[PDB]
């Protein structure tokens, strides 16, 4: 906790949610669907101004895909994180078939579709979103947590236009002085030390930050092949072999190259002053970090959200008519 005021605020919030039951909520509309389950916008019956994104997961699909540890870690990390740049997980529920994760609703919409529709983001737009991620990473890395799934698809906008990290399925708390060893992530975004199975730590995230900048500035990540093997070889060749288009400002290219160092120990953010070295890079000259943290900074893209029940920034989905999944009572979900 930052201080005693924050400690007390979060304990009061936890006690507020501990008292709630699934029956205290109304379903408003669906935010997303898939084989994993659905994300529903839900409303607190006793306080209609409080709405939430409830991710409802079929437990059998989690077991089939061997993601029990991933979802347990997602719960622990997300429920324990208290950052304005990370979607809050307030609490969980469970029954025999489903897990329910009650999260902060971000009603501004998905960033990746905006990026696709515009082709690429201007320098100042990209700088705002990159700074949001930089703050989220400052928090996570201060707690020894690797995020490990940075990509435009895992950035969601709230109603103001602030970006937040969602989807902690690959996030992991790493022990002090330890590395982690699982080959996972999206191929274009995986760092070379993950490809070479040398173990990785929070510095892999700084690699991903570079990729993100490049993608946001150009519409595509810098390393890409026809199949993941060629992509991995390209990655192992290094960022210094990638052509930086003139579209990318010189300071942005410099920062990307410092983030995508082959050696994790040399990556900006992993040096003497940690994430502060990223924040002081000349690309961020004139960027109001204090205003970003205070919420006074004007986002580059303003979604309009008329009310806490407005889902107009999300696709429409027919309500669930699928067969209920089989019961799952193996017991790996005790803490939920
Ligand atoms: N807190 C949230 N607020 C608003 N929309 C959300 C929220 N969480 C998830 N969504 C939406 O639901 C989608 C699924 O979220 P996600 O955390 O990626 O679950 P998932 O199990 O990984 N589904 P998928 O990405 O298809 O594998 C997101 O891409 C968003 O469009
Ligand atoms: Mn996702
Ligand atoms: Mn996902």
Residue by residue, DSSP assigns 284-315 as GTT--HHHHHHT-SPPSS-----STT--TTS-
Helices 203-218, 250-259: axis angle to 10 degrees equals 150
Resolution value, angstrom units: 1.8
Query: Which ligand has an atom closest to residue 154 CA?
Result: 2
* CATH number belonging to domain 1-14+110-304: 1.10.510.10
333 Cβ contact partners less than 8 Å away, ≥ 6 residues apart: 59, 94, 99
Cα(39) to centroid(ligand 1), Å: 6
Whose CA is closest to atom 26 on ligand 1?
34
Contact 250, 258 (CB under 8 A): no
The Cα–Cα gap between 334 and 336 comes to: 6
288 Cβ contact partners less than 8 Å away, ≥ 6 residues apart: 296, 297
Ligand 1 within 6 A of CB of 102: no
**Do 1-14+110-304 and 15-109+305-334 have matching folds?**
no
Ligand 1 within 6 A of CB of 106: yes
Binding residues for ATP: 31-39, 55
CA dihedral 293, 48, 78, 213 (to 10 degrees): -50
Instruction: Report angle CA 149, 289, 168 to the nearest 5 degrees.
Output: 20
The Cα–Cα gap between 177 and 7 comes to: 27
83 Cβ contact partners less than 8 Å away, ≥ 6 residues apart: 135, 136, 139, 140
Contact 98, 37 (CB under 8 A): yes
* CATH number belonging to domain 15-109+305-334: 3.30.200.20
Whose CA is closest to atom 18 on ligand 1?
167
Q: Residue 299: which of 148, 205, 160 has the closest Cα?
A: 160
Please count the residues of the chain.
336
The Cα–Cα gap between 73 and 26 comes to: 28
Query: Residue 182: left if φ>0, alpha if ψ -120 to 50, beta else—which one?
Result: beta
Distance from CA of residue 276 to its chain's centroid?
20
Exposed/middle/buried for 66, CB within 10 Å: 0-12, 13-18, 19+?
Answer: exposed
Residues with a known catalytic role: 149
Q: Is 218 helix (H, G, I), strand (E, B) or coil?
A: helix
Cα(193) to centroid(ligand 1), Å: 28
- Strands lying side by side in the sheet with 25-32: 25-32, 37-44, 51-58, 98-104, 89-94
The Cα–Cα gap between 22 and 20 comes to: 7
Q: Which atom of ligand 1 is nearest to the CA of 106?
A: 3
Q: Which atom of ligand 1 is nearest to the CA of 105?
A: 3
| β pairing state of 155-157 and 172-173 | unpaired
Cα(244) to centroid(ligand 3), Å: 29
**Domain residues of the chain, as ranges?**
1-14+110-304, 15-109+305-334
Experimental method: X-ray
Q: Residue 39: which of 97, 96, 107 has the closest Cα?
A: 107
Q: Which atom of ligand 1 is nearest to the CA of 39?
A: 12
The Cα–Cα gap between 25 and 44 comes to: 5
DSSP letters spanning 94-128? E-SSEEEEEEE--TTEEHHHHHHHHSS--HHHHHH
Contact 223, 233 (CB under 8 A): no
Contact 158, 106 (CB under 8 A): yes
The total of other beta-carbon atoms located within 10 Å of residue 130's CB is 25
Cα(246) to centroid(ligand 2), Å: 31
């Amino acid at each position: 906790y930052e201080d005693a005021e924050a400690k007390a605020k979060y304990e009061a919030e936890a006690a507020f949610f501990a008292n709630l039951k699934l029956s205290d909520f109304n379903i408003i509309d669906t935010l997303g669907v898939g084989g994993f389950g659905r994300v529903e916008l839900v409303q607190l019956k006793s306080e209609e101004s409080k709405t939430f994104a409830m991710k409802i997961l079929k437990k059998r699909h989690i077991v089939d895909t061997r993601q029990q540890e991933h979802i347990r870690s997602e719960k622990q990390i997300m429920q324990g994180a208290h950052s304005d740049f990370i979607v809050r997980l307030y609490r969980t529920f469970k029954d025999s078939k489903y897990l329910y994760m009650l999260m902060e609703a971000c009603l501004g919409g998905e960033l990746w579709t905006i990026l696709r529709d515009r082709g690429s983001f201007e320098d100042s737009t990209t700088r705002f979103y990159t700074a949001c991620v930089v703050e989220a990473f400052a928090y996570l890395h201060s707690k020894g947590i690797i995020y490990r799934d940075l990509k435009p698809e895992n950035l969601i906008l709230d109603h103001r236009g602030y970006a937040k990290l969602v989807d902690f399925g690959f996030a992991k708390k790493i022990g002090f002085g330890k590395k982690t060893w699982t080959f996972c992530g999206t191929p274009e975004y995986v760092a070379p030390e993950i490809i070479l199975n040398k173990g990785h730590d929070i510095s892999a995230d700084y690699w991903s930050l570079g990729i993100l900048m490049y993608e946001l500035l150009t519409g595509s990540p810098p390393f890409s092949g026809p199949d993941p093997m060629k992509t991995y070889n390209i990655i192992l060749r290094g960022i210094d072999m990638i052509e930086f288009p003139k579209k990318i400002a010189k300071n942005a290219a410099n920062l990307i190259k410092k983030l995508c160092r082959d050696n994790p120990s040399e990556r900006l953010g992993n040096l003497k002053n940690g994430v502060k070295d990223i924040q002081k890079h000349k690309w961020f000259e004139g960027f109001n970090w204090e205003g970003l943290r205070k919420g006074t900074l004007t986002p580059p893209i303003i979604p309009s959200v008329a009310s806490p029940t407005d889902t107009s920034n999300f696709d429409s989905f027919p309500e669930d008519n699928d067969e209920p999944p089989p019961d799952d009572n193996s017991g790996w979900d005790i803490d939920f």
